[PDB]
Amino acid sequence: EAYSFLDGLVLELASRPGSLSLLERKLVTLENNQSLMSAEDFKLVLRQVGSQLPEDGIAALLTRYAPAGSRPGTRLDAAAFRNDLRAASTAA
Amino acid sequence: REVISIHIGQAGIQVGNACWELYCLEHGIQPDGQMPDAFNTFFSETGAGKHVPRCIFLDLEPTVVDEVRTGTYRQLFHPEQLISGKEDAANNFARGHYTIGKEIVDLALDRIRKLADNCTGLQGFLVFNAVGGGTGSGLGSLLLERLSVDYGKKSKLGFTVYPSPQVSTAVVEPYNSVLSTHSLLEHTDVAVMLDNEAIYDICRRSLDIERPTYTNLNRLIAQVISSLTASLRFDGALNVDITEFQTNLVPYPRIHFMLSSYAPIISAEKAYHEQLSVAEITNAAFEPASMMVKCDPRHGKYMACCLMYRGDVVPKDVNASVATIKTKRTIQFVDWCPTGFKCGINYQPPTVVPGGDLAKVQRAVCMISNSTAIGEIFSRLDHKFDLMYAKRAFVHWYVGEGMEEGEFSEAREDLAALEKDFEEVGA
Amino acid sequence: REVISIHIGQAGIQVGNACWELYCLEHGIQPDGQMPDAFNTFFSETGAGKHVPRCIFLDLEPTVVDEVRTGTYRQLFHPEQLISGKEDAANNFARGHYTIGKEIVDLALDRIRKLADNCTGLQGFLVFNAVGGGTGSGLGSLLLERLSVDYGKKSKLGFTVYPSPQVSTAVVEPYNSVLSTHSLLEHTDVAVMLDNEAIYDICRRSLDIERPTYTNLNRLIAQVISSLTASLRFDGALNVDITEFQTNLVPYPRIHFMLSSYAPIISAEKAYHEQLSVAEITNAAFEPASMMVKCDPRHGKYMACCLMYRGDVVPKDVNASVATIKTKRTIQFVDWCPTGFKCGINYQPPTVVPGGDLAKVQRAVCMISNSTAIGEIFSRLDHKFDLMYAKRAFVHWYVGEGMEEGEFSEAREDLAALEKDFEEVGA
Amino acid sequence: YGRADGTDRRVQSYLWHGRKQVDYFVPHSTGGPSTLSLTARKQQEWGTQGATDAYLTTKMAATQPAALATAENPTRTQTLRPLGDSGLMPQPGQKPK
Amino acid sequence: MREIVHIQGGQCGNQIGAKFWEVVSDEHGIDPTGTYHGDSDLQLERINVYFNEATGGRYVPRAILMDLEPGTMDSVRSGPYGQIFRPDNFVFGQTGAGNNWAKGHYTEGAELIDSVLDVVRKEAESCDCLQGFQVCHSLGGGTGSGMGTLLISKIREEYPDRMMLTFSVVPSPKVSDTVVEPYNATLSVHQLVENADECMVLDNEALYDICFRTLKLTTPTFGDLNHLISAVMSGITCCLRFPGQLNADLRKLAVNLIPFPRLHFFMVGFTPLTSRGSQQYRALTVPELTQQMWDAKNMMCAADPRHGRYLTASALFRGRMSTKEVDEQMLNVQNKNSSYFVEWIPNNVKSSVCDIPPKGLKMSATFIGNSTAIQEMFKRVSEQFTAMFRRKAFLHWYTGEGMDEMEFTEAESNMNDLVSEYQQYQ
Amino acid sequence: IHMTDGIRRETMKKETLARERSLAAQSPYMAQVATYRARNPPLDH
Numbered sequence A: 001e002a003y004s005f006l007d008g009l010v011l012e013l014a015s016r017p018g019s020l021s022l023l024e025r026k027l028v029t030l031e032n033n034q035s036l037m038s039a040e041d042f043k044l045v046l047r048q049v050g051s052q053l054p055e056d057g058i059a060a061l062l063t064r065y066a067p068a069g070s071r072p073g074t075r076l077d078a079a080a081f082r083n084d085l086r087a088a089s090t091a092a
Numbered sequence B, C: 001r002e003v004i005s006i007h008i009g010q011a012g013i014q015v016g017n018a019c020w021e022l023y024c025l026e027h028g029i030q031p032d033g034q035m036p037d038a039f040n041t042f043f044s045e046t047g048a049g050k051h052v053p054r055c056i057f058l059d060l061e062p063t064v065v066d067e068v069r070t071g072t073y074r075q076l077f078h079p080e081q082l083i084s085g086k087e088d089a090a091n092n093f094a095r096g097h098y099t100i101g102k103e104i105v106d107l108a109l110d111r112i113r114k115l116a117d118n119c120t121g122l123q124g125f126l127v128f129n130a131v132g133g134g135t136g137s138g139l140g141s142l143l144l145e146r147l148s149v150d151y152g153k154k155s156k157l158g159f160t161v162y163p164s165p166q167v168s169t170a171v172v173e174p175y176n177s178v179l180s181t182h183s184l185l186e187h188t189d190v191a192v193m194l195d196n197e198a199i200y201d202i203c204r205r206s207l208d209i210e211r212p213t214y215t216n217l218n219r220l221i222a223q224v225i226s227s228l229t230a231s232l233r234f235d236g237a238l239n240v241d242i243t244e245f246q247t248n249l250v251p252y253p254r255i256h257f258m259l260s261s262y263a264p265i266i267s268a269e270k271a272y273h274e275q276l277s278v279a280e281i282t283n284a285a286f287e288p289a290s291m292m293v294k295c296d297p298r299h300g301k302y303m304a305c306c307l308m309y310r311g312d313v314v315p316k317d318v319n320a321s322v323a324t325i326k327t328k329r330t331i332q333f334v335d336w337c338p339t340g341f342k343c344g345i346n347y348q349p350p351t352v353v354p355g356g357d358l359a360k361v362q363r364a365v366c367m368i369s370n371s372t373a374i375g376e377i378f379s380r381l382d383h384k385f386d387l388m389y390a391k392r393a394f395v396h397w398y399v400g401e402g403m404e405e406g407e408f409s410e411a412r413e414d415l416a417a418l419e420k421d422f423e424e425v426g427a
Numbered sequence D: 001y002g003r004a005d006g007t008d009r010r011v012q013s014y015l016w017h018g019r020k021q022v023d024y025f026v027p028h029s030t031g032g033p034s035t036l037s038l039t040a041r042k043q044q045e046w047g048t049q050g051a052t053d054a055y056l057t058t059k060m061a062a063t064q065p066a067a068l069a070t071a072e073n074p075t076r077t078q079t080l081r082p083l084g085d086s087g088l089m090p091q092p093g094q095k096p097k
Numbered sequence E: 001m002r003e004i005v006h007i008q009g010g011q012c013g014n015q016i017g018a019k020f021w022e023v024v025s026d027e028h029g030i031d032p033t034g035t036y037h038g039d040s041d042l043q044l045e046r047i048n049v050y051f052n053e054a055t056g057g058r059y060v061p062r063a064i065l066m067d068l069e070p071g072t073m074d075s076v077r078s079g080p081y082g083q084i085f086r087p088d089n090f091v092f093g094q095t096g097a098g099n100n101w102a103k104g105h106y107t108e109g110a111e112l113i114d115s116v117l118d119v120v121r122k123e124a125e126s127c128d129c130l131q132g133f134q135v136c137h138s139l140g141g142g143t144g145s146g147m148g149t150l151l152i153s154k155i156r157e158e159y160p161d162r163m164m165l166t167f168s169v170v171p172s173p174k175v176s177d178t179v180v181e182p183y184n185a186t187l188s189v190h191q192l193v194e195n196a197d198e199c200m201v202l203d204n205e206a207l208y209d210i211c212f213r214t215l216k217l218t219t220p221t222f223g224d225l226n227h228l229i230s231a232v233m234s235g236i237t238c239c240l241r242f243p244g245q246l247n248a249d250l251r252k253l254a255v256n257l258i259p260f261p262r263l264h265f266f267m268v269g270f271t272p273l274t275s276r277g278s279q280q281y282r283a284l285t286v287p288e289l290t291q292q293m294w295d296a297k298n299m300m301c302a303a304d305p306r307h308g309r310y311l312t313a314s315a316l317f318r319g320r321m322s323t324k325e326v327d328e329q330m331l332n333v334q335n336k337n338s339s340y341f342v343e344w345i346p347n348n349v350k351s352s353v354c355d356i357p358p359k360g361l362k363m364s365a366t367f368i369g370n371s372t373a374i375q376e377m378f379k380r381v382s383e384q385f386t387a388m389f390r391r392k393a394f395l396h397w398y399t400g401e402g403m404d405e406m407e408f409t410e411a412e413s414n415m416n417d418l419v420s421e422y423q424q425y426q
Numbered sequence F: 001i002h003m004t005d006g007i008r009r010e011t012m013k014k015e016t017l018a019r020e021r022s023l024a025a026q027s028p029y030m031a032q033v034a035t036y037r038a039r040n041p042p043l044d045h
Ligand SMILES: Nc1nc2c(ncn2[C@@H]2O[C@H](COP(=O)(O)OP(=O)(O)OP(=O)(O)O)[C@@H](O)[C@H]2O)c(=O)[nH]1
Pocket: B008, B009, B010, B011, B012, B014, B015, B060, B061, B088, B089, B090, B091, B092, B130, B132, B133, B134, B135, B136, B137, B161, B163, B169, B170, B195, B196, B214, B215, B217, B218
């Protein structure tokens, strides 16, 4: 269940208000030429923004937002994940 | 007080890739570029919420620079700063000094001022290069020449990498080193020598990593650089800035070559057992088993010394230990220097890189001395330069680039005059 | 006030293996190196919550050394204070004195210098070796010789493991023993012999252990060493330092060989049995059934005695007991030392190790005396040296390593001279 | 010396005697991590030998774990000032800005 | 009334001045916020000698802090009693000399001394009757020694009649920080002998010595050394600040210790100095102050007086004391070792008594001995300067600036004739 | 000079340690003093 993790994440970033707009700056800059981010990179970005989420939860988010045709947890679709995160941001 | 660092060559930007990793970890900067005043000497506060270093990497092969562009610090370095040519110099002073530099050097020094203009209290430039390579030697000398013309009075610190005596990665590096040092004499203000066997011996003996790569070499070289700029960055009880070198370490304007050393180079477990005190690390920074250049100061006489201290140190014991050294007779200072020491104390302890091999230490020493064992280094390199040159080996490469035998002869005799100079002072 | 201890050979470091377990128990130091000023003479404090002994184990075979390195005492010992070669000396004095000694002794001498500098009030050295082997005898004597030329004036308390007359675990041990003592004369200031058959008889007679091993020997030897350094460690009513063995027990520059004894050697149940007081333990410390070296003092005459007392002892009864001894005519003194007794009293009772065969005792006595039955010992060993030497047996081994016939002949006649000296002083 | 057996009875108890009185209680094997540390280490090594990624340049293979590890628990080593043996406190000589 | 304005040069000067103003503010009871909080009305009557009333009991010191590197400035502002200095008095360059006397005296002076002269002239002409200037600086660094020397010269040419103190520390071969110590010390001293009124010589080697023997501290940081020099400075100008049975101003001390206009290099001691462990087991009598004051290991210079002669001497006392015991102890120490005093001057000891002790104490003292053992220190420096200048070490950094060789020759010449005249009167 | 420096530290440690030990020892000694003082009653004049 990755949607619950995304909701918990947007609620966590509701506090320390600078940390939300900082994260979308991360997914754009640390992006690949294609909108793909490595699993290590995604975990590093979450920790750098200071969000602490269980490693199993990080895996769930990666599986939900994984790029098509890749290994199950190897990469992540930054553009899809960001466009999905904007929705929970504006809903919260 | 701000200082900008330029890196020439494939070794240069790998040294930079370690130094700037250390700086960011020291000031808590994320690899994205922003923190979650003391940093002002290296990072500018761009725009809003973003620190971009005061550095220019420049190289002629695009491979290693593009690796920097795709590494971990993709955003931690300004895009324009990382210059890169289209084809390398390929172990050739002449090819790197007359063919490709005339295109890339004008853009480079146009971009360094666009950095010095942003600066206000520029302490100096400091260069990183290996003279064994092609672009490190040739283009490096071409840049240093036009730097001296453009600024002149500003200090240009130098941390160079000479070829090691027996372990070597090239063949024409004697020619490259010689034709580089003819300009390294009268263009750089202070020049610090860095050989690789000495660093290999340190990592094999002290840190007991049996298979070190260049990364560990670059790591502890960055420890040295960080420890001698820490007086600008952090605050101590007796601080020395970048100007003090050219005052207290160069007795004659043509003698600026300084052996470096570091202690304690200690692994994780040996930290727990050795009770690190100021006395024994002041001893440890003096043995030939712990220097950054494979030479022996037992053969030489110290013309001056500088001692950078970091961490939990009081001026009392450092003055006590420096007294014991001054009274010991295993090593011998030159007669004309009555007070051949200069101490500098800083409180910020040296940080560790996770995954690195050094441990969390309370105190450290970075020694930078001037001696005559370097006059031994240049002679040992000159011997094997004239060995090749007697048969005119590889010469057709340089003459094919367009050069002649004149600069060969004049560089040879320039080194000879330097040996005469070193044997003189050492009297 | 501090003292450092070195252990040479296979026997040396097994003994110190007991000795350092005892020290950790006495000062309450866990085998991981921290407590849960009286320890200052053995364990230095490193940083915060650590203790690291002043000792060096050394051996050429790494097998028993890294057995220590993989034991429970991994964190306690400094990683580099366990020196280990690569290959054994193999019961060969010349092999252990010239072939491998020349490369191991310089490393051990630098390390000992580091320990000395980290020391402040150095009392002296005390060594632990067996002369029957090659590593302990050969580079032992080599290190003793180089320690004498380095410090010299500092006393060297040497506890050496001599071979038993009939019980023996080697064949060329006479050649090794004579070649070892030949330098043990003029380099050890105070040398205490420790045999093996004597302790076998002790462990069979009083502790009634019917099948003892080396660990029993080492544990009670450790009890003896701790009993004679207890005066330095703890406060007593009348404490003697390590300097007074040098004075009170050595009447001539070449008569330094002592018979050690220790009482009461009593197991657990016999402690309930026996009523321990000072008169009987002073009596028990004199009959040959409680000496640590197999010889008969009835055949010889005493020169000088020293007695450590630990625990609830008043000077009164000990004076009464020695008074009863001097008036007893079973044992006889020499005419050139009418006051041939030395006393020392420390307050703390000796501690017990879990699993040891020694019971918790109120008071103990360690006697270190000199006699001429030792002159009988060297003759008994000398005769069995000549028996092999006449036929030139096993000589090709030593001369193959690099020595010649001169050393055999001169060591033989030097023990002849020592024989004549004991015979002369005995008159 | 390591007291591998839990109950530390005696030195000679571990030796083999003729008598069953003691032969029953002589221990045969000492099982624990205190022994198995070496196989733990070398099995970790054999595992990392078996599982390897081909496309990991050394330069970037070194940095990535470091950048993660410092991100995990970010502590900035603050300037430690040695407390002088007095009521006075150091008040250092310089200050950056 | 009589006004003392303060001048600090260099990092040593700033940190000494920081502890000095901390102690004086403690004496007059003014809090680190700047307001009076004392009890006795003795502290109100003589704070115009050091402070200036701003408003509502705000007394700001009359000090001029001068340096070339912001590290000293921020360290001053950060510490306690740091928010009491006026920021206008923080005249302060930006490039920094850095152990170069020539930079401190020719290049950076040209653009700094105009601003310092503006501040100090405003600070002097602000008060009516100047007693004199006070200068504390170092002789090792550049902006302390070089700029301080230039300021001393310009002041003595501007305000000639006023008094002038100079507390200078001299780097010793035992405690030797920098390399160009002689090249700085000799040139500075060559100027101090013609311009400064009197100079009192400190030395860090002697201070570390005293903090080891007497105070028995284990880790003597610079704070403790600054604490000792501050106790000296307070004990010197105590008589102006508090009434006594026998007053003594700075000019009174100068006329009673300077018999010849070129012999103005004193040595200093301080008493009582006892460790806190030995603080219970001591008596407090004038004998107990004199036996420790006249002790040779108590001097704040690296000059053993038992290797020379006391030309003149002086002793300032603090606390309600008996003048009879003061004078008889002075007589006893004067008549016992009659060989250590010069002959052609009887009654070599000037004495003074002030009835206010330093806070936390009952009875203290200060000593100023104009001896001929100070030429031991000057030879110990001039021999190293000859060792370098015989051979043009580091000379290029001074020649390529405007300074030439004859400055070094005349500096050597004045060094030699000064030690010659001190040796003559021995 | 390293010896002369470490001497100071060891002396300081042992000095303060002696203070602690003696402070502890004083109270039982004073107790015995009180006990044997109780035996002697002063006289009445
Ligand atoms: N100490 C050290 N030396 C290095 C390092 N990387 C390269 N070198 C040295 O660099 C020297 C040759 O120069 P390179 O940097 O390899 O190549 P270059 O300087 O770009 O010259 P070209 O190959 O012609 O472009 C060799 O002697 C190497 O030992 C490094 O990371 N550390």
